[PDB]
């Protein structure tokens, strides 16, 4: 319990989000920086 309150509240992480299942072709060009 001493280590438990030190760690504190376990973070909640919303399971699905803005990420939209993009194509590998388009993900490649978005990731290709100038």
């Amino acid at each position: 319990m001493q280590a438990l309150h030190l760690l504190g509240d376990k973070p909640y992480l919303p399971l699905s989000t803005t990420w939209s299942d993009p194509r590998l072709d388009r993900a490649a060009d978005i990731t290709t920086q100038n």
């Binding site: 919303p14 399971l15 699905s16 989000t17 803005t18 939209s20």
Partner: protein, 293 residues
């Protein structure tokens, strides 16, 4: 509590519906545990037809499912707009629905696990209304940069050539939507063009949309769009450049969480009482009603 004796306290607790793991009917729990010790599954009860017939089936059987009588009153309740504003008073009391909207507060309130809450929040996209009613759709939306749940009212308003089609809009994320539409009349389009109003073309489809086909599109509508009572203008453009244009406005309103939280409460309490997976319950509820009710 101003209660002196133990049984008055347990009577109070048996009906304290506003709290997150009451109502707790102690005599019912004792009876259920004693039965499941002495005759697990009621094999001897069902082997005696006379006793089984002195009971209703749904009464002996509802003692297997661990549904207490007040929990049965909770789950039976006819939740609808026009009573949700006071059934929230009955079922949650004083906790603001804005606080209870936060996933952390609600998970602490039901003492749920993180992965247990996560599947209910996925199910939340089903918890809304499943189809348009009175040209309105009222739905929860995640938009969860902070995890929070927001309920949107979408109000449809047919503006233009409503005899061409029915059109319906169904969000699934922040500025992320499904648009559904279904034609009434046939026009041999060279392509189907669909725009925000007649302005920003959100999708185009080549060829002729057919009658009695429900087409769909994963459109987007942005803040500067959905703050308006925006139109959605669809346009079957024929090879001649003629068109069966038709359109409807869609007002987007932010809305109270009452009817959402009451349905989530029913789902959580039912899943916890019957120790059944939320997927199983969702697969059962659709076999009665096309509305999740």
């Amino acid at each position: 509590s101003k209660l002196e004796n133990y049984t008055k306290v347990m009577e109070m607790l048996s009906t304290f519906r506003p709290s997150g793991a009451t109502p707790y009917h102690d005599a019912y729990e004792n009876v259920r545990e004693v039965i499941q010790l002495q005759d697990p599954g009621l094999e001897q009860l069902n082997a005696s037809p006379a006793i089984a017939g002195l009971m209703h089936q749904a009464s002996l059987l509802g003692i297997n499912a661990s549904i207490s009588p007040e929990l049965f009153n909770i789950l039976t309740e006819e939740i609808t707009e026009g009573n949700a504003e006071e059934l929230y008073k009955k079922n949650f009391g004083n906790i603001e629905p804005a606080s209870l909207a936060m996933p952390e507060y609600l998970k602490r309130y039901y003492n749920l696990s993180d992965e247990e809450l996560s599947q209910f929040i996925g199910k939340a996209s089903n918890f809304g209304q499943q189809e348009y009613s009175n040209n309105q759709l009222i739905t929860p939306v995640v938009n969860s940069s902070d995890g929070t749940v927001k309920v949107y009212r979408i109000t449809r308003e047919y503006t233009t050539n409503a005899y061409q089609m029915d059109v319906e809009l169904f969000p699934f994320g922040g500025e992320n939507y499904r648009l559904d539409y279904k034609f009434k009349n046939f026009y041999n389009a060279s392509y189907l063009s669909i725009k925000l109003n007649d302005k920003r073309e959100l999708v185009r489809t080549e060829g002729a949309p057919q009658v009695n086909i429900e087409y769909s599109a994963n459109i987007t509508l942005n803040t500067a769009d959905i703050s308006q009572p925006f139109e959605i203008g669809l346009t079957r453009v024929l090879p001649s450049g003629s068109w069966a244009y038709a359109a409807a406005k869609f007002t987007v309103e932010e809305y109270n969480q009452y009817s959402f939280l009451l349905k989530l409460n029913k789902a959580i309490r039912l899943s916890r009482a019957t120790e059944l997976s939320p997927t199983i319950l969702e697969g059962i509820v659709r076999s009665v009603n096309l509305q999740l009710d």
